[PDB]
Structures are given as C-alpha cells and as structure tokens.
Design a protein around this ligand. Sequence first.
Ligand SMILES: *[C@@H]1O[C@H](CO)[C@@H](O[C@@H]2O[C@H](CO)[C@@H](O[C@@H]3O[C@H](CO[C@H]4O[C@H](CO)[C@@H](O)[C@H](O)[C@@H]4O)[C@@H](O)[C@H](O[C@H]4O[C@H](CO)[C@@H](O)[C@H](O)[C@@H]4O)[C@@H]3O)[C@H](O)[C@H]2NC(C)=O)[C@H](O)[C@H]1NC(C)=O
Ligand SMILES: *[C@@H]1O[C@H](CO)[C@@H](O[C@@H]2O[C@H](CO)[C@@H](O)[C@H](O)[C@H]2NC(C)=O)[C@H](O)[C@H]1NC(C)=O
Ligand SMILES: *[C@@H]1O[C@H](CO)[C@@H](O)[C@H](O)[C@H]1NC(C)=O
Ligand SMILES: *[C@@H]1O[C@H](CO)[C@@H](O)[C@H](O)[C@H]1NC(C)=O
Ligand SMILES: *[C@@H]1O[C@H](CO)[C@@H](O)[C@H](O)[C@H]1NC(C)=O
Ligand SMILES: *[C@@H]1O[C@H](CO)[C@@H](O)[C@H](O)[C@H]1NC(C)=O
Ligand SMILES: *[C@@H]1O[C@H](CO)[C@@H](O)[C@H](O)[C@H]1NC(C)=O
Lengths: 49, 215, 50, 298, 50
Amino acid sequence: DVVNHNAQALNTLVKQLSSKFGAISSVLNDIFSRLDKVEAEVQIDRLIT
Amino acid sequence: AYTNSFTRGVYYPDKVFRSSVLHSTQDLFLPFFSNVTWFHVIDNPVLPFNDGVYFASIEKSNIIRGWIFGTTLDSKTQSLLIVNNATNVVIKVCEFQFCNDPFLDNCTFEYVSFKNLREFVFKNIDGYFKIYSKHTPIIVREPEDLPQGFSALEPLVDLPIGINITRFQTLLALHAAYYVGYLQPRTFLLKYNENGTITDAVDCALDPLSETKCT
Amino acid sequence: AENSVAYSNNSIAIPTNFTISVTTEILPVSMTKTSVDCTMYICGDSTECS
Amino acid sequence: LKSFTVEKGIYQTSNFRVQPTESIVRFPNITNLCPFDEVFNATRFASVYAWNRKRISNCVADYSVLYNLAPFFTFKCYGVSPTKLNDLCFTNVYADSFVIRGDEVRQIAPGQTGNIADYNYKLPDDFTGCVIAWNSNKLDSKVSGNYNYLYRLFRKSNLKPFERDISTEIYQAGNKPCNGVAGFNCYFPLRSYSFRPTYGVGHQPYRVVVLSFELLHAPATVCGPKKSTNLVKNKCVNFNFNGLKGTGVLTESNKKFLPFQQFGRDIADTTDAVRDPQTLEILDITPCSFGGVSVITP
Amino acid sequence: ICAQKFKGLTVLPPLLTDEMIAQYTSALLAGTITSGWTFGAGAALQIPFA
Ligand SMILES: *[C@@H]1O[C@H](CO)[C@@H](O[C@@H]2O[C@H](CO)[C@@H](O[C@@H]3O[C@H](CO[C@H]4O[C@H](CO)[C@@H](O)[C@H](O)[C@@H]4O)[C@@H](O)[C@H](O[C@H]4O[C@H](CO)[C@@H](O)[C@H](O)[C@@H]4O)[C@@H]3O)[C@H](O)[C@H]2NC(C)=O)[C@H](O)[C@H]1NC(C)=O
Ligand SMILES: *[C@@H]1O[C@H](CO)[C@@H](O[C@@H]2O[C@H](CO)[C@@H](O)[C@H](O)[C@H]2NC(C)=O)[C@H](O)[C@H]1NC(C)=O
Ligand SMILES: *[C@@H]1O[C@H](CO)[C@@H](O)[C@H](O)[C@H]1NC(C)=O
Ligand SMILES: *[C@@H]1O[C@H](CO)[C@@H](O)[C@H](O)[C@H]1NC(C)=O
Ligand SMILES: *[C@@H]1O[C@H](CO)[C@@H](O)[C@H](O)[C@H]1NC(C)=O
Ligand SMILES: *[C@@H]1O[C@H](CO)[C@@H](O)[C@H](O)[C@H]1NC(C)=O
Ligand SMILES: *[C@@H]1O[C@H](CO)[C@@H](O)[C@H](O)[C@H]1NC(C)=O
C-alpha cells in the first residue's frame, strides 16, 4: 500500500495536466497562438490556477 | 432474421498514436453483444441509416459489390453510390437513379481510386462522411454467423460532402450473407500495445462488471 | 466460537506443557521521497508562461 | 533562497540560466495561391437560402487581401484571433458568401434569435470561424428594387444548424393545407427585400462571408503565408509543425506509426511524437530546459 | 516513469541503501544472539544462549 499510494498520486498528478479547467484548450501554446494577449492571459490564468 | 454481434465493430477513433495504454473514449460505437440483422444472398431491402451503420459481409468471391445511400432515392436529391470493380473503384454522389433495380452489370463529387470476411463502418458527422474498413479472411469452419473474436478497423475514406443520409441499400453481384447493425453513443475502454494496435476493448454500459472495469 | 469457562469456588487449571510460537509483525518505516519542480510542471518550456 | 548568505548543505536550485531558442518552421509545400477572388470578386453571389458553400482545400490562404483592402467592415472571429490567422494552418476551410440587409448583419452570431439567425445563419454552440461584411452599394443595389436575392420567413419552426436544405414547399403558417397553393394564412417562402440605392444605410445590402475553419492540428492542406526552413535536430529549438508550436529537442524516434497516424501522445496527453508534413519522418520531442540541479556547499 | 521525469516530478533515492540496512539488522541480530539485552544497556557481555 505504501508503494501503491505513492505511485497512484503521481499518476493522478501527471494525468491532471490534460484538464482544461474551463479554458478553451489544455495545450499551453495553442492559446498563445490562437489568441492575442488581451484574452490569452485570462484563458491561461485558469490553467495556472 | 437476427443474430448476435460478438465484440466487433471497434474502430480507431482518432489519428493519435498511443502505445501501451488504456484509454477511455466517448463516441458512436457498436455496443457489445448487440442484436444485428442478418440477410442471405438470393436480397437487398432498403434499410435506415440512423446515426451510423456497421456493415459486414461473409462471401465467396466479390458477391457484394457496392452501396447506395440517400434520403428519398427518387432522383431529386443526392444519393451516394459506391461501386467497386476489378478494374478500379468508383465513388459518386450522383442524384439520378440509373437502374430500375440496382445490380452489377452534373455530379458534385467523384472519386476514383464464405471465404472472405469484410467489415465496414459508415458514419456521418455534420454531413462529413467517414468510412472505416477491415479485410481479414476466414479459410475454414464457417458457422454462418459473426465469428467470435476482436479486430480493429482502420480509417480509409473521409468525404467532405455535407450530404444528408437517412436510408441505405447494398449492391449484389450479377452477370453468401451480410450483416447490418446500428451505432450508439457509448463509452469504450481501449487497450493499446507497443505497436499502437487496439487489442482489447470494454463497453462501459454493458453490465456492472464492465462498469467496474471502466471505473 | 462461543466458549463457557468453568468457573468454580475451588477449581484451577494449570498447564502441564507449552509451545514456542514465532509470529510476524510488519511495520512501514518510510515512503517514496518525491520532488517537484514548479515551473517545469505548471508551464513547461515556456518563457512567457513563466 | 532570496538571500545573500547561504548556509551549509545541499539545495535544489531553480534554473535562472537563459536558453536561446531557434525558430524552426515546417509547413506543407503547396504553391497555389487561394482563389478568394472567386468568393469576393464574382459578378453575382449565390442564393442566400440555398446555402451554397464554397470549399477551400488546396490553398495558401494569404490574408493580406483581407487586411490591406478597403471593403472590409467587421472581423467577428469566434475561437480564433483574426490578427494571428496568417501563422496557423487549417485542414479544410468553408465559405458561406451571401448578401444580407445591413441592419441584420448584427444577427449573424450563435445563440441569437432572428429571421437571419434561425433559418440560414444558424451557427452552432461550438462554432469557430469568422464573419466578414462589407457594403454593396455599387453592385447589389438597383433601381426599383433588386430581385437577385430571396429570403425565407413566416414559419415558427427552426431548421438544424449547418444542414443544407431547400424548402420549396409553402411554409404552412395556417392550419389549412396549402399544398403549394396560396390561400388563407399560406405564405410563399421566398421574399424579396427589393434593395434600392435610395434606402437608408442600414437597409442597404451588405456582402457577408462566413468562414468556418477547423482549428485542429491534423494533416492540414490550408496554411498561411510563411516559409519552411531547415529541420534542426539534436539541439534545443523551437518548432512549428502545421501551426502546432512547441519548444524542445527533436530527435529520431523508433515509434512505428500507422500510415494514417499523425501524432503521438504521452500519458498526460501531451504531444511526444510528430510526423513531418514534407519528409514524412517521425520525430520525438524531448524537453529543452533541465529542471534544476543540486548545489552542495559549506 | 520517464513521463514524470519530463514533467518536473523526480524521485530522490534514500540515503541508506539496502545493504546498509541489512548490515544494521545483521549487527542487531549478532548482538541479540551473543549478548542478550546487555548490548542495549552499554557494552556487550557474552553469555551462552542456554
Ligand atoms: C509436551 O508436548 C511435547 C510435544 O509438543 C511432548 O514431547 C514429545 O515431542 C516429540 C516431538 O516434538 C514427539 O516425538 C514424536 O513421536 C512420534 C510417536 O508417534 C508414534 O507413537 C504414537 C503413540 O504410540 C502413535 O499414535 C503414532 O502413530 C506413532 O506410531 C514419532 O513418530 C515422531 O517421529 C518422527 O519425528 C522424528 C523427529 O522428531 C523423526 O526423527 C522420525 O523419523 C519421525 O519422522 C516423533 O519422534 C513425542 O511423541 C512427544 N512425547 C510424547 C510422550 O508424546 C511432551 O511429551 C509433552 N509433555 C507432556 C507432559 O505431555
Ligand atoms: C434528412 O432528410 C430526411 C428526409 O429527406 C429528413 O427527414 C424529414 O424530417 C422532417 C422533419 O422532422 C419530417 O417532417 C419528414 O417527414 C422527414 N422525411 C422523411 C422521409 O422521413 C431529415 O430531417 C433530414 N435530416 C437529417 C439530419 O436526417
Ligand atoms: C434479437 O431480437 C430477436 C427478436 O427481434 C430476439 O428473438 C433475440 O433474442 C434478440 N437477440 C438478442 C441477443 O437479444
Ligand atoms: C443537376 O442537374 C439536374 C437536372 O436539371 C438538376 O435538377 C440539379 O439541380 C443539378 N444539380 C446541380 C448540383 O447542379
Ligand atoms: C510490435 O512490432 C514489432 C515489429 O516491429 C514486433 O516484433 C512486436 O512483436 C510487436 N509487438 C507485439 C506486442 O506484438
Ligand atoms: C461458592 O460459595 C458460595 C457461598 O456458599 C455459594 O453461594 C456459591 O454458589 C458457590 N459457588 C459455586 C460455583 O458453587
Ligand atoms: C514537397 O512535398 C512532398 C509531399 O508532401 C515531398 O515529397 C517533397 O519532398 C516536398 N519538397 C520539399 C522541397 O519540401
């Protein structure tokens, strides 16, 4: 259980990077490329939070 | 005449290569152990298309020759016709009906490019037509129903047509049996090996055990 | 299993033999030591996100 | 540590080292300039409610025409910024070029209710793309009314979004069966606004092109005007594959792609393997920056 | 494991390797066998196991 919990928490932390958190995309560079700096910052603030 | 599909109809849902991973997806799939309709070769009655059609054919040598898709099939609107030939394969969307009964002897789009088991999946997304195929033969011990096993269907044809389809009909060779099933929105668990080939799948809504597997 | 001890005013039970038992007790002492780089995890190879 | 004095021990240090980047661009090598003049400079536009859609597949979409010419009014783009459209790539582009009354040009938006918003310009909830309009006083305004455009109304039923259809049958506003014959509360579908140059500025006709893009980074046949440079490997470089930007070392990979497969994705659904759009070789992406080192000091 | 290393998530090794933990358990076993409880209170005093 000590091995499995420490593996499972790291797997969850890795898999959580595909989430959008209400933004348009989970890919960081796509928001920068598809939007200008007025709304790219407010879209990536959700990802950072 | 009804028969039972046996863990068949799983296609590649995207172009993304994934290696040695279990991936859960939400798409129009043929449900596991569903009830499919089975026809003999004499007949080709006209059948509805719904949200998607899984087609299968067990045939001797090129008994099935093509397909007809449409809505009214009365030479007023577009009807997608696929005819495969030993020379070359023809796909057209011509509106006009040519034969009184369809058999083997200003269109907006044209494209020219029991020993045999063939599986196909035809579906439309916003009028965009996707055709997935698989061609693996069976040599001996043909039981005249769906063979028990698993295989993955690779994408072949993408047509940017925008053509509404509601009903369809197949084409037979003239001078064997075929299977039709319908796709439903399902969540599937897919297994990818080191090659990237889909080797196993789990239908999440089939039974509580597979729901536990998906959880 | 239900047992009934034969209690009495003048009655004792004294063992006439023994046995030597060896049991196993298992105790975790430590776990996996992890470390997280914050910039490489959150943004990752992106200067303007940093 | 945000301190000038460091105590004795081992410390994990975040990287303050500056790594310069070299931009590498890679795009499909199609040389055909896109015929936007077939959409714009045509003599007569298409029928408004017939939903005649123009398909753009093999093109170099140069938007300098869209930005450096006088007749352009609005650039209402949803899901993408118009100012960065020349840097990306698209799979298939679709154009709906019809003529609307100017006061109804504001009705071309998803989630709106109107005669234009419900029957021909019904954008879905997940619509991406741009709406462009300009004036048509010189071409689409005629003396005693222009009859080249016909419009459909007088129905309480709304059609499906992005389903091309023709309704030649009479819109049955009344309960009595019209059966293609005008009668009580039976209105013919096609109606002419009869555009004139003597009308108001809002009532003057406007030429409107709705461009729908597919913003996926799939095998793309439409790209903006940009060169393609040499593929630098085994070094920390930027990369731009079909509009897909990234930073990292591109190396040779042994992941045997299926012939229809374009991208490889990791456990975290991040892009790990790519396919070159020209040479059709498979490249592995390794992160550039080392995350941090340990400093052992007294 | 390589995906976590690419994402800023590293795992540090322990300070004491398993050979050294085995040497500690060997020392404790040898002291318990050859000296009883006397090595826990100070210097080890040899005594027969009987
Ligand atoms: C307290 O309890 C202990 C045991 O916990 C008793 O001590 C003796 O313990 C030894 C083993 O620890 C016993 O020895 C064994 O005796 C067997 C005799 O079995 C034969 O006889 C009985 C009775 O007649 C028959 O029912 C049976 O079928 C047999 O015919 C031997 O067969 C055993 O030999 C095996 O093991 C030895 C190794 O020990 C091998 O070398 C042999 O080849 C063979 O495989 C074994 O020798 C012994 O029986 C116990 N003593 C008694 C009297 O039972 C204490 O006696 C007890 N104290 C009190 C006060 O109760
Ligand atoms: C595709 O075409 C069919 C028929 O051409 C359409 O079905 C019609 O739908 C209307 C509205 O519900 C009905 O009043 C008609 O009776 C239907 N016709 C038939 C023959 O059933 C269908 O709506 C079109 N679109 C889709 C997405 O299937
Ligand atoms: C399929 O349907 C038929 C009747 O339509 C029924 O008799 C048969 O049991 C069904 N098969 C399955 C597997 O449910
Ligand atoms: C093709 O010609 C027929 C014959 O008049 C016509 O009804 C139909 O609308 C035409 N289709 C196209 C797409 O031009
Ligand atoms: C993957 O393909 C290789 C050939 O390139 C083959 O040797 C290997 O066995 C395949 N993997 C599996 C799990 O079959
Ligand atoms: C023990 O002695 C007391 C006093 O005579 C008596 O009441 C009790 O029942 C006795 N207990 C037993 C178990 O005999
Ligand atoms: C142009 O593209 C084709 C196919 O995409 C490729 O085979 C060829 O090498 C490319 N040429 C250059 C100069 O990039």
